[PDB]
DNA sequence: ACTTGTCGGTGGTCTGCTCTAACGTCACGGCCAACCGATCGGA
């Protein structure tokens, strides 16, 4: 780490752990209401591909009304 | 070795300082049993060692407020080191040895300590164990004695004097409790005779608590832990008796002196006696196994007692 | 220039604070004190010595691969095994520990007890001995605790190592020493007296040996882990059976003069006053137990205690009294 | 009294090289399946 980052972490007390944040976030320009979550784990006897331990899929549902720019025909 | 013990102490200092937020120098020195300079050197050595990388916000940091010690960054030292087999075994052995001693410690507390230590270390039935799960043989006199010692209150004890073979009720003020050999003795000041005497727990039938919190004289005059004024004195008479080979019971329970070996059993020993009657009873108990040699007066008294006993048995039916 | 204690402290801190296994090269480069090694072999020898010393202190080092995709081995100290579970101690337990920490006298036992007390105090609880105000007077005259100190330490060490014990034991000072080789099982105390429990390899029986009789030559022999005592065996029950065999013997009626024989008065089960030969007293029906002990107790009091039944005990007492009254010639 | 540089040994794991002696002896497989224009090399 850069010396400034180490100094800041020392001052504020946030310990520097060897972890990288990879949180899943909603992509740009998307929203809606979560309707279903499916979680797969290797320990539950699932035919997961080799090297994979956890796999979670989140479904987002959205209702789109008609507006400017939409194409009708 | 010494270095290993120093390392263990230095590693376990951090949890101790975390447990007590503002422990002073004197308390730490008393807890660790070390001098001030040694504790200061150990604290300095512990101050400048910590996380790899060696940043001032990474290694162990303290906060000195006057003469107080506080921890600001444990550097991962959150719990003390575990207990090795030897020290845990020694602690368990000491606790199980002291639980059976009457009056030195409450049996319930000893059992609770044993259970908690076994749970913490995870020991099993393959370790040292006691004889009785629940004693229940305490008549309550030991608890009263301990309460009197703690609260410094007058106590009444009915002590059986083995030398004189009589029951004497005395009012004494407890001073301290000491252990001699395998028989713990209670040390207290008796106003009836104005002297310090040692009373054994098994010889006390019952104890009565009184509301007379009077300070005993010895604390105001002399409070020596030993006070063995009559335990071993040259003024105590000594009896010279012949001991047979068969009568080997007394070779262990009594302090025989001047022991000499003879295949024909013509060599005797010498043992002190508190009272003439006690020595006479001790001689008469063994029967023909013990022969009286000196003094002549003791032998004559024993012979007269034996003749009187024979006459009494002849008269009785 | 880094002291050995500082080096070991740095090493243990680095191992504890690292969640992944570390190879030797990373420890050499990172941890201070390992950068002054003139050669790689010297560093390896020093690291092996330090690791052996740390392992001797009970720290549970774990060795494994750095990663599932790598072959090099690394080092890591488990935090769960390194940390003892928390325990809450009351005032009574603290007083008990403070009283018990001042019993041993051997330097090894004293050091072990001091280390255990230090660890217990650092766990969070407080132990104080000045509040109780109880000390120990006798320090070199105890035949059970002080006398049987090195022997007890050797037996405990052998039990921990799971090895047989060879020693010399004699039933009495009159008898001769006999070499005994038994497999230890445990130590049980009764009335403040130690009793070693084990199985003899020369007689094939379970025997209890009093530690006072056993000399200090408690040599441990046999490979470690070769002793597997059954779990269902209750050592305390065996010790209790060995302490006393005869339950109550028989019932004997003894006449004792009133006001005396308090020791025999306490042992009386039933009492019945009776005056014989112009002397008042009470006739008590008591047990027998050890015949010799009862005979000695009766003969000690002389005319104070008069035996009535059985006739054999009265005859024995009369014979002993006649032998005493013979004048010491025989 | 404690500790360390220097010396030598075991066993396991990862990595590389050399050897094996009945007789054996010259490959299928084939896309491509457009369209126009310009240029160099044979007949």
Q: Which two tokens stand for residue C198?
A: 């084990």
Angstrom distance (rounded) from CA B280 to CA B276:
6
Torsion of Cα atoms, B27 then B29 then B30 then B33, to 10°: 160
State the alpha helices, DSSP H only, in B207-275.
Answer: 217-221, 250-253
SS3 B31: helix
Residue nearest to nucleotide D3 (CA to C1'): C4
What determination technique applies here?
cryo-EM
Angstrom distance (rounded) from CA B302 to CA B174:
39
The DSSP line for C22-79 is B-HHHHHHHSTTSS--SSHHHHHHHHHHHHHHHHHTT--EEEEES-TT---EEEEE-H
CB spacing of A11 vs B58 below 8 angstroms: no
CB spacing of C57 vs B108 below 8 angstroms: no
C117 CA to D2 C1', in Å?
26
CB atoms within 10 A of CB C227: 19
In chain B, count H helices and then E strands: 10, 12
Contacts for C229-237: CB closer than 8 Å, 24+ residues apart: C229/B126, C229/C183, C229/C185, C229/C186, C229/C199, C231/B125, C231/B126, C233/C185, C235/B129, C235/C185, C235/C186, C235/C188, C235/C197, C236/B129, C236/B130, C236/B131, C236/B132, C236/C188
Nearest nucleotide by C1' position to the B2 CA atom: D2
B267 close to C (CB below 8 A): no
Distance from C43 to chain B by nearest Cα, in Å? Answer: 18
Question: In whole angstroms, what separates CA C160 from the centre of its chain?
Answer: 13
Angstrom distance (rounded) from CA C235 to CA C11:
44
Angstrom distance (rounded) from CA C126 to CA B16:
10
CB spacing of B313 vs C321 below 8 angstroms: yes
Q: Which of A15, A17, A18 to mutate to test the interface with B (most CBs of B within 10 A)?
A: A15
CB atoms within 10 A of CB B169: 12
Contacts for A49-53: CB closer than 8 Å, 24+ residues apart: none
List of residues 6+ apart from C37 with CB closer than 8 A = C28, C43, C46
Cβ atoms of B267 and C289 within 8 Å: the answer is no
Cα separation of the two ends of chain B: 73
Cβ atoms of C190 and C212 within 8 Å: the answer is no
CB spacing of A6 vs B57 below 8 angstroms: yes
Angstrom distance (rounded) from CA C34 to CA C24:
10
Nearest nucleotide by C1' position to the B4 CA atom: D2
C115 close to B (CB below 8 A): yes
Cβ atoms of B262 and B314 within 8 Å: the answer is no
Strand D: which residues have Cβ below 7 Å from it?
Answer: B 1-4; C 4, 7, 36-39, 41-42, 45-46, 49-50, 53, 71
Q: Which of A8, A16, A17, A18 to mutate to test the interface with B (most CBs of B within 10 A)?
A: A16
A50 CA to D27 C1', in Å?
39
Q: What is the CA radius of gyration of chain A?
A: 21
C29 CA to D24 C1', in Å?
61
Angstrom distance (rounded) from CA C135 to CA B146:
14
Q: Among B10, B176, B181, whose Cβ lies nearest the Cβ of C138?
A: B181
List of residues 6+ apart from B53 with CB closer than 8 A = C30
Residue appearing with tokens 């023909």: B288
CB spacing of B4 vs C57 below 8 angstroms: yes
Neighbors of chain A by Cβ distance (3+ pairs < 8 Å) = B
Q: CA nearest B243: which of B272, B225, B267, B227?
A: B267
Distance from B146 to chain C by nearest Cα, in Å? Answer: 10
Angstrom distance (rounded) from CA B304 to CA B280:
10
Nearest nucleotide by C1' position to the C7 CA atom: D3
C126 CA to D19 C1', in Å?
75
CA angle centred on C308, ends C306 and C310, rounded to 5°? 130
CB spacing of B58 vs A10 below 8 angstroms: yes
SS3 C219: strand
B118 CA to D12 C1', in Å?
39
CB atoms within 10 A of CB B181: 16
Q: What are the backbone dihedrals phi and psi of residue A65, each rounded to the nearest 5 degrees, phi first?
A: -85, 165
Q: Which residues of B touch C183 (CB under 8 A)?
A: none
Distance from B55 to chain A by nearest Cα, in Å? Answer: 8
Angstrom distance (rounded) from CA C187 to CA C145:
13
Distance from C196 to chain B by nearest Cα, in Å? Answer: 10
Neighbors of chain C by Cβ distance (3+ pairs < 8 Å) = B
Q: Which residues of C touch B51 (CB under 8 A)?
A: 13-14, 17
Angstrom distance (rounded) from CA C270 to CA C285:
6
Q: Which residues of C touch B130 (CB under 8 A)?
A: 188-189, 236
Q: CA nearest C252: which of C319, C306, C323?
A: C306
Nearest nucleotide by C1' position to the B6 CA atom: D2
Cβ atoms of B176 and C135 within 8 Å: the answer is yes
List of residues 6+ apart from A57 with CB closer than 8 A = A37, A38, A39
Cβ atoms of C21 and C75 within 8 Å: the answer is yes
List of residues 6+ apart from B48 with CB closer than 8 A = B59, C6
CB spacing of B292 vs C328 below 8 angstroms: yes
CB spacing of B90 vs C112 below 8 angstroms: yes
Q: Which of residues 126-185 of B touch C (CB under 8 A)?
A: 126-132, 149, 160, 162, 165-167, 176-182
Angstrom distance (rounded) from CA C234 to CA C231:
8
List of residues 6+ apart from A14 with CB closer than 8 A = none
Q: Which two tokens stand for residue C29?
A: 């480069």
Total number of residues shown for chain A? 73
Angstrom distance (rounded) from CA B145 to CA B15:
38
Distance from A8 to chain B by nearest Cα, in Å? Answer: 9
B123 CA to D19 C1', in Å?
60
Angstrom distance (rounded) from CA B132 to CA B129:
9
Element (H, E) at B196: strand B195-200
Angstrom distance (rounded) from CA C276 to CA C280:
7
B159 CA to D42 C1', in Å?
145
List of residues 6+ apart from B186 with CB closer than 8 A = B103, B145, B174, B177, B198, B199, B200, B201, B204
Beta-bridge mates of residue B24? B68
Angstrom distance (rounded) from CA B11 to CA B14:
7
Q: Nucleotides of chain D within 7 Å of a protein C-beta? A: 1-8, 13-15
CB atoms within 10 A of CB B235: 5
Q: CA nearest C319: which of B100, A72, B138, B313?
A: B313
């Amino acid at each position: 780490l850069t010396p400034e980052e180490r100094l800041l972490r020392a001052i504020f007390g946030e310990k520097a752990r060897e972890v990288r944040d990879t949180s899943l976030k909603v992509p740009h320009g998307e929203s809606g209401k979560v309707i279903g979550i499916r979680v797969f784990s290797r320990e539950d006897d699932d035919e997961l591909p080799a090297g994979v331990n956890e796999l979670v899929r989140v479904y987002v549902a959205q209702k789109r009304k008609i507006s400017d720019g939409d194409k009708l025909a | 070795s010494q270095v290993s013990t120093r390392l263990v102490r230095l590693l376990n200092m951090v949890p101790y300082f975390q447990a007590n937020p503002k422990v002073t120098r004197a308390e730490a020195a008393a807890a660790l049993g070390v001098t001030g300079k040694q504790l200061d050197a150990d604290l300095d050595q512990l101050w400048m060692c910590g996380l790899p990388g060696y940043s001032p916000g990474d290694l162990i940091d303290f906060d000195f407020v006057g003469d107080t010690i506080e921890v600001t960054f444990s550097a991962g030292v959150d719990h003390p080191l575990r207990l090795t087999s030897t020290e845990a075994t020694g602690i368990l052995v000491a606790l199980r040895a002291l639980v059976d001693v009457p009056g030195m410690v409450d049996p319930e507390a000893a059992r609770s300590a044993i259970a908690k230590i076994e749970s913490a270390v995870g020991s099993q039935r393959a370790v040292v164990e006691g004889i009785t799960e629940d004693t229940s043989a305490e008549p309550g006199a030991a608890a009263t004695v301990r309460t009197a010692v703690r609260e410094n209150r007058a106590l009444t004890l009915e002590y059986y004097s083995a030398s004189r073979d009589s029951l004497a009720t005395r009012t004494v003020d407890p001073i301290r409790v000491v252990l001699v050999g395998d028989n713990s003795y209670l040390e207290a000041w008796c106003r009836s005779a104005e002297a310090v005497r040692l009373f054994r727990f098994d010889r006390i039938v019952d104890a009565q608590l009184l509301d007379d919190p009077a300070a005993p004289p010895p604390p105001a005059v002399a409070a020596g832990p030993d006070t063995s004024l009559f335990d071993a004195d040259p003024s105590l008479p000594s009896a010279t008796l012949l001991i047979g080979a068969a009568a080997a019971w007394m070779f262990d329970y009594y302090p025989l002196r001047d022991i000499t070996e003879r295949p024909d059993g013509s060599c005797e020993a010498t043992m002190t006696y508190a009272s003439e009657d006690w020595m006479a009873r001790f001689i008469l108990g063994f029967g023909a196994e013990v022969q009286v040699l000196a003094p002549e007066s003791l032998a004559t008294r024993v012979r007269q007692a034996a003749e009187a006993a024979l006459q009494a048995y002849a008269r009785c039916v | 220039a880094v002291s050995k204690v500082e080096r070991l402290m740095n090493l243990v801190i680095a191992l504890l604070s690292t969640r992944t296994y570390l190879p030797a090269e990373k420890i050499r480069t990172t941890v201070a004190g390992y950068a002054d090694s003139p050669s790689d072999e010297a560093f390896s020898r020093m690291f092996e010595r330090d690791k052996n010393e740390l392992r001797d202190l009970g720290i549970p080092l774990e060795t494994g691969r750095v990663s599932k995709w790598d072959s090099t081995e690394g080092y890591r100290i488990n935090r769960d095994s390194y940390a003892l579970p928390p325990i809450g101690l009351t005032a009574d337990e603290a007083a008990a520990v403070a009283v018990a920490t001042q019993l041993w006298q051997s330097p090894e036992l004293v050091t072990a007890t001091q280390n255990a007390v230090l660890k217990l105090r650092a766990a969070g609880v407080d132990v104080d001995a000045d509040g109780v105000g109880v000390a120990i007077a006798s320090t070199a005259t105890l035949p059970g605790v002080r006398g049987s100190e090195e022997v007890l330490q050797s037996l405990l060490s052998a039990i921990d190592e799971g090895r047989a014990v060879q020693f010399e034991h004699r039933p009495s000072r009159s008898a001769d020493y006999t070499t005994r080789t038994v497999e230890p099982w445990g130590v049980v105390t009764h009335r403040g007296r130690w009793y070693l429990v084990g199985h003899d390899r020369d007689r094939e029986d379970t025997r209890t040996f009093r530690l006072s009789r056993i000399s200090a030559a408690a040599r441990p022999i046999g490979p470690a882990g070769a002793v597997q005592k059954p779990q269902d065996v209750n050592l305390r029950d065996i010790v209790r059976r060995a302490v006393a065999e005869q339950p109550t013997g028989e019932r004997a009626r003894i006449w004792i003069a009133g006001g005396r024989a308090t020791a025999l008065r306490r042992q009386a089960v039933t009492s019945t006053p009776r005056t014989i030969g112009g002397r008042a007293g009470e006739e008590i029906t008591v047990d027998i137990g050890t015949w010799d002990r009862l005979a000695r107790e009766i003969a000690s009091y002389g005319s104070d205690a008069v035996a009535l039944e059985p006739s054999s005990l009265r005859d024995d007492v009369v014979e002993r009294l006649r032998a005493h009254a013979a004048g010491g010639e025989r």
